[PDB]
Each structure stands twice: as structure tokens, then as C-alpha cells.
RNA sequence: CCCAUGAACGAGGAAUUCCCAGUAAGUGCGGGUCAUAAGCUUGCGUUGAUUAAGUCCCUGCCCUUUGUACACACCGCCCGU
């Protein structure tokens, strides 16, 4: 009857100023007709892209979600929406003679975004260990997840979201996870396994625009 | 009279063990009791790797694998070969298959 | 009609295959999702229950799939294989291979593959009684 | 669809109900020379050069 | 002084490539004035394959229990006329003489598929000399019936017979034929 | 044996038997029986061979392990108003 790609118009999609890869791809609307118009249509959503897509020299199992705001100029413009390990890596790090602590916290930012980080770390085996397998005890593992938790709040609630994204990118929460609890048991695989943001404030164009540079 | 000194499962100090769902019928059989079979497998199957390969828009992209775990129950595992019956002697190896 | 903005680089879709072992879909979409190209099945494409499934059926289903993104401007794919999920298998049926397969071999360009089966943190009752079932 | 000339190095068997394909595994000499394996029929004797049209066909085993 | 028939020769025929004879090949004692030299093509597999094209070609048509096996059947036939079209050409017949059937040829023929299930059948192929003379066996088949209860008959189809032979172009039926099986066989890689 | 008086006049319900090279099949001949009595059988040549150099799917057999409440041995044993 009527072909409807015929009244659909591209759009381009932008990441924020955060990655070095600004343009993530393009996406689809149909054109603005009566009650429905375009820029309606893409306010909402959300773009799962692997980090190596939006920074040239980082790992490809980490995917950033992000969700468009506002179009003009037939650009679309996102922010961080959330954060997330692929399936095989996740499955790839838990294995059966370890013991795996996860955390997790609901720590706002310092312009009102409210995130739940989520933190996996697990149990190391020594380079020079007989036992077959390497557990921590309930009190250590107790003691490593109040120190993840400890480290997320303290690296999220003090900066904004721009720079708990700058940190999200290497990781640097994993890592300093990694470091702190080397003492209580030694872990080996720490990250921050998943991001999800539960309130957001008011919207702000002006923020938007400081944020794509 | 006794087959197994363990009773065909792995339960020693305890009196219930969850069960699970065998994945072939979904019977409930015992996790202790259940064999289970941990599956690394690549996503793209060898025969097509090399064409998966030349069609990626990435350089040495490294396929992803699969994780599966597989819960069989006794008689779904015996049927689809995965464990086989053995003499009275050969029972008591516990050792996995060399493969 | 379709973007015809910068001809030397690739134009990226994401192709969502469900391959469950009574059918298999072949649904590219758009990159966020929520637009989709084209979805072809397997059993549009066999006039028989069985081969619903088949791994003939998910190449012909494949090779539509990618002719009608090749006419509509698309020109590389990102890859979201999932099986049934849930309490269900996890295993993807007999049609994802082929129909991956067919994607790559029909003038495709493949991005990044992930596997996307619904996996519960725990789950609720299977279909099955206590004693599964008996066939 | 190339042409590629390649030498069978072993027999694996047949297969089917009653038996009704053959098995063989023939390596390439002019294509940075490996191993591909390629179900086939008829007398293709002990290593004789099986012609490849097409170097995506395989053997799907057992 | 070596020359090949009575007016052939092996000195002129050259290739500058020792991989392509599998279709004619004439270096040694094998090389036969007539193709009446007896033997038994049963005996042992890979000995039909060790055949002479040119034997398999007018032999196989010992088919129907009547006409089965009769070696002066199939030397008349290619005897017979083909004493008059060597006198009668005096030209090249090599153009359609190679360029129909010995390049006609499939691709690839199938093969049954697990244990049940006469839907459609997995392609495969062989090294060309089965393929290529499995066309031969439905060609001899077929050239019958172009003569079975037809009108051009057996002992004075030379032309095709020599077509049916000789090297390397297409333009068969039972050929196509294969062709089309090749094809809805070949919808499975 | 001859007059040529014209019989679905050219790959066959369900079920299937035998067979892999001088197999099959066609074809005659000789022995036995006998009165040179053969449509039978036992041999012999003659013409001459499409398909297959495989499998354990059907029917079975064998060199193992396993289960059994069978041992008249699965045509077994055995439960139910």
C-alpha cells in the first residue's frame, strides 16, 4: 500500500564530550505528521555501544548506554545512561574454585544523578599456592564488600557525573577496589560491574551543551 | 544390595540439597545428585569462523563464547550418552574422561 | 530514503536473532532498537512445522533479511544472538549458525557479537511436573 | 567460486543409515597450504587430488 | 612416425601442462588404434575409473538384457561412419567436438543426510572423473532415449558420440539436468 | 515345422526371494529317474553383465560391559473387581 521507509528521515547520533568517538552511528524516525513529530520520537532511546566503539585504545567488554535528550539540527545528543560488562566476560570471570564478592551502592552525584553501581571482584590464587581452591572467609568477604562499598561511594558522591563517567571509562574504581583489599584477600578480577542510573534531575539544555564540549 | 557407597550422589554431612531441573525433561533432581556439564563453546561454530572473520568490520575482533551450564538428570543423561554404564570395577573412577 | 551520507564508511544496524528450536528469527533493527529494518522467519520462508527451525530456513530468512538492509542503506551489523531463556534452555537452536552465516556470506559486515538470552536470577516453575516429562 | 587443487591426505569413513557418503581430508598447495576436511562420493582414491570450486564447504561430522 | 590412429599424432597436441590430462591421455601402451582391447571394468573399483573415456563412453550403452556387454556392438558403432565422417569432414569437428559435452559438466552432486528425512540432500562433489562420467552414465541414458522409440539411432550418432568425448565447453542436457540438481542441492552450503 | 488366424502386443496389489565377474540373467546340452520317458534336479559349456568395494537402519550372528523378580530360560515371568 504505502511503503513507510519512504517517510522516514536519518538522524545522527552523538556521543558526550567524554569519548574520544563522537558520532556512534545514525538511527530512524518518520518525519513530523500531525499529532506525532520527530523530535518526540527520539527522546528516549537508548544506545548499548562497546566502550573500544567510543574510546580507540580501551576494551571492548565494557558497553556504555546512552539515551538522547534532545535532537537539533538533526543530531541527536546523549548522555550516560548506564553502564555494563558483556555476557561472555562476566561468564568468563566466574569460575568454580574462587570465591566472588559483589556490592553494590545508590550513591547520587554532585548535580542531582542518582546511580546504583555494581562491583564484582574475585578471589585470587596465589602464584605459588598447592590448594586447589582459594576462599575467603565470611568476615573477609564482609570486610571486602564494606570496602567496595566504602570506595564507590567515595569515588561517586563527591564528583559529578562527567567525572564518575572520566573514572567509569578505565575503571579506576575496580582498580583502586583491587588495591585496597589486597590485604584483607587478594583479589583478581575487580570491576564495576554495572551502572544504572535510578533518578535523574530536571533537565537542563544548558547542561547538555556543556556536556557534548 | 548396594550399588554406590555414595548412593549416586555427592551428598556427605547434610540432610537436603536443593533440587534443580534436568535440562532436557525439567525433572527435579538433586543439584548434588545431578550431573552437570560446563560448556565453553564459540558463538560462531569452526565451520564458519573463517567467513564470520573476512565479514567483521574489526581487525582481530576475537569471537565471543558461550556459557552454558547443563543439569541432566540420570536417565537424560544416559540417554544422550554423556555418561555411559561401567563394570563393577571401572565404577569407582572417579577421574574425568582424559578427552 | 536511506543515508547516503558518507559512502566510504559503514552504516550499522544491530541484528537480533532468536533462534529457539521450534523457529528462528532474523530481526535487524535500528541501532537503539526501537526501528526496525526488517524482520524475516524461518517459517515464512518453509510451508512445513518442522523446518521452521532448520538451518535452510534461517539462511533464506538471513539472505532476505540482508537484501532488504543492503536496499534500505545498511551496511554493517552488530549481532544479539539469544536463545528461549527464562527457566527454559539457553543453548540457541539449530538455525543461529546459518543464519549468522548467511548474514556474513550475502555481502554483510558483521560488528560485535553478544549473546543476549534472557537469564533469570532465579526463576519460577519450568512447564515440566517434578518428574519432567515423559516423551 | 575458485579452483584449487588439493591432495588427499586421509579416509575418514561413510555415513548414513545403510552408508551413503565418503570422507576424506585435503590439504591445499598453492593457497599458504592447511588442512580442510570435505565430505565427498565416489572412487577418490588413496591421496589423489580432489578439486575444490569453493573453499567453504565442509564436513559436518557425526 | 608415431602418429596417433592413421591421422592423429601425439607430437602436435601439447599443453605445456603435465595437471590436465585426465581427460585425454595418450603417453604410453595405453594409447588404442581401436578400442576393442577386451578387459573387465567389474573387477575391482577404481578400475572403471582407470577406464578410457573413450571405452566408457561407447561401452556403457551395454544396457537392457538383450543388447548387454556386446563388444562387437559398440566397435561396428564407432567403426561404421566414422570411416566416412573422417573422409567426409576433412575440417576441424574439434570446436563442438569438445566444446559442447567435456565442458557441459556439473559441479557437484549430494549425498543423503543423517538417518531419515527424503526432503532435500546435502551437496557434495568428487574429484571431477565420478561427476563428470556420472553425467556420462544419465547421458548414455539420455542419448538412448533420443534414440529409444525415437528417430536418430544408435551406430550413426558419431558426432555427438565424438562431442560426448573429446575436451572442455558447454552445451549438454542430461548435463543441465545435473545442473538443476546441482543447483537445488547446492541452496545448502 | 510350415498357412502369417492377431493375444493389457514395449519395467508390474499388499508382500517379498536370489545375487558382487566369467555374479545375475538369457541359452541350449548331458547325467539321475528311464521304455532315446523332464515342466525336476545334478552338472556342462555359450552370450554376457547395470550396480556395489559400504553400513549396522530392517533380519540376524559374534569376541565385551551392564540390568533382571527369567532358568520350561521373553512364546519367560507376572498384576488386577
Redesign the interface.
Given at each position: 500500500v504505502v511503503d513507510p521507509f519512504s517517510k522516514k528521515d536519518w538522524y545522527d547520533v552523538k556521543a558526550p564530550a567524554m569519548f574520544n568517538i563522537r558520532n556512534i552511528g545514525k538511527t530512524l524516525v518518520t518525519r513530523t505528521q500531525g499529532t506525532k513529530i520527530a523530535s518526540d520520537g527520539l527522546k528516549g532511546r537508548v544506545f548499548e555501544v562497546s566502550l573500544a566503539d567510543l574510546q580507540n585504545d580501551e576494551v571492548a567488554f565494557r558497553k556504555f548506554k546512552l539515551i538522547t535528550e534532545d535532537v537539533q539540527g538533526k543530531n541527536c545528543l546523549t548522555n550516560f545512561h548506564g553502564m555494563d560488562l558483556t555476557r561472555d566476560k562476566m561468564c568468563s570471570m566466574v569460575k568454580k574454585w574462587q570465591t566472588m564478592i559483589e556490592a553494590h551502592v545508590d550513591v547520587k552525584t554532585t548535580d542531582g544523578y542518582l546511580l546504583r553501581l555494581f562491583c564484582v571482584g574475585f578471589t585470587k590464587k596465589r602464584n605459588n599456592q598447592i590448594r586447589k581452591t582459594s576462599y575467603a572467609q565470611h568476615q573477609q568477604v564482609r570486610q571486602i564488600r564494606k570496602k567496595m562499598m566504602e570506595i564507590m561511594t567515595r569515588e561517586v558522591q563527591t564528583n559529578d557525573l562527567k567525572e564518575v563517567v572520566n573514572k567509569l571509562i578505565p575503571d579506576s574504581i575496580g582498580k583502586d577496589i583491587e588495591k585496597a583489599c589486597q590485604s584483607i584477600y587478594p583479589l583478581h578480577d575487580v570491576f564495576v560491574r554495572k551502572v544504572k542510573m535510578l533518578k535523574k534531575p530536571k533537565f537542563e539544555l544548558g547542561k547538555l551543551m556543556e556536556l557534548h564540549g | 544390595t548396594k550399588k554406590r557407597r555414595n548412593n549416586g550422589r555427592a551428598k556427605k554431612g547434610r540432610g537436603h540439597v536443593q533440587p534443580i531441573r534436568c535440562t532436557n525433561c525439567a525433572r527435579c533432581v538433586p543439584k548434588d545428585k545431578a550431573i552437570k556439564k560446563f560448556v565453553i563453546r564459540n558463538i560462531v561454530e569452526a565451520?564458519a569462523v573463517?567467513?564470520i572473520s573476512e565479514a567483521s568490520v574489526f581487525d582481530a575482533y576475537v569471537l565471543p563464547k558461550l556459557y552454558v551450564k547443563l543439569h541432566y538428570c540420570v536417565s537424560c543423561v544416559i540417554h544422550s550418552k554423556v555418561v555411559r554404564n561401567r563394570s563393577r570395577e571401572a565404577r569407582k573412577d572417579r577421574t574425568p574422561p582424559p578427552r | 530514503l536511506g543515508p547516503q551520507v558518507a559512502e566510504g564508511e559503514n552504516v550499522f544496524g544491530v541484528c537480533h536473532i532468536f533462534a529457539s528450536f521450534n523457529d528462528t528469527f532474523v530481526h535487524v533493527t535500528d541501532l537503539s532498537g526501537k526501528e526496525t529494518i526488517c524482520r524475516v522467519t524461518g517459517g515464512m520462508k518453509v510451508k512445513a512445522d518442522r523446518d521452521e527451525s532448520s538451518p535452510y530456513a534461517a539462511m533464506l530468512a538471513a539472505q532476505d533479511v540482508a537484501q532488504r538492509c543492503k536496499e534500505l542503506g545498511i551496511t554493517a551489523l552488530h549481532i544479539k544472538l539469544r536463545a528461549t531463556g527464562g527457566n527454559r534452555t539457553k543453548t540457541p537452536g539449530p538455525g543461529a549458525q546459518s543464519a549468522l552465516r548467511a548474514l556474513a556470506?550475502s555481502g554483510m559486515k558483521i560488528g560485535r557479537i553478544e549473546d543476549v538470552t534472557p537469564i533469570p536470577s532465579d526463576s519460577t516453575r519450568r512447564k515440566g511436573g517434578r518428574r519432567g516429562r515423559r516423551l | 567460486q575458485p579452483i584449487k587443487?588439493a591432495r588427499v591426505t586421509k579416509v575418514l569413513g561413510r555415513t548414513?543409515?545403510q552408508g551413503?557418503?565418503t570422507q576424506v581430508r585435503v590439504e591445499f598447495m598453492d593457497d599458504t597450504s592447511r588442512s580442510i576436511i570435505?565430505?565427498?562420493?565416489?572412487?577418490?582414491?588413496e591421496g589423489?587430488?580432489?578439486?575444490l570450486?569453493?573453499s567453504?564447504?565442509?564436513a559436518?561430522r557425526l | 612416425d608415431i602418429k596417433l590412429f592413421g591421422k592423429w599424432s601425439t607430437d602436435d597436441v601439447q599443453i605445456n601442462d603435465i595437471?590436465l590430462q585426465d581427460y585425454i591421455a595418450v603417453k604410453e601402451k595405453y594409447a588404442k588404434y581401436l578400442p576393442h582391447s577386451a578387459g573387465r571394468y567389474a573387477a575391482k573399483?577404481?578400475r572403471?575409473?582407470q577406464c578410457p573415456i573413450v571405452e566408457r563412453l561407447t561401452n556403457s550403452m551395454m544396457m537392457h538384457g538383450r543388447n548387454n556387454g556386446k563388444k562387437l556392438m559398440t566397435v561396428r558403432i564407432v567403426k561404421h561412419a566414422f570411416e566416412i565422417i573422417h573422409l567426409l569432414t576433412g575440417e576441424n569437428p574439434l570446436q563442438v567436438l569438445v566444446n559442447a559435452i567435456i565442458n557441459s559438466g556439473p559441479?557437484?552432486?549430494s549425498?543423503?543426510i543423517?538417518?531419515?528425512g527424503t526432503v532435500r540432500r546435502?551437496?557434495?562433489?568428487?574429484?571431477?572423473?565420478?561427476?563428470v562420467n556420472?553425467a556420462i552414465w544419465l547421458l548414455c541414458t539420455g542419448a538412448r532415449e533420443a534414440a529409444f522409440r525415437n528417430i536418430k539411432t544408435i551406430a550413426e550418432c558419431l558426432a555427438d558420440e565424438l562431442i560426448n568425448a573429446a575436451k572442455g565447453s558447454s552445451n549438454s542436457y542430461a548435463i543441465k539436468k545435473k545442473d538443476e540438481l546441482e543447483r537445488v542441492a547446492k541452496s545448502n552450503?
Open positions: - | 565451520a573463517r567467513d | 556470506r | 587443487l548414513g543409515s551413503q557418503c570435505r565430505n565427498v562420493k565416489g572412487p577418490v582414491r589423489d587430488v580432489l578439486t570450486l569453493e567453504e564447504r565442509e559436518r | 595437471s573399483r577404481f572403471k575409473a559441479r557437484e552432486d549425498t543423503r543423517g538417518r531419515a546435502q551437496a557434495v562433489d568428487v574429484s571431477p572423473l565420478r561427476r556420472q552450503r
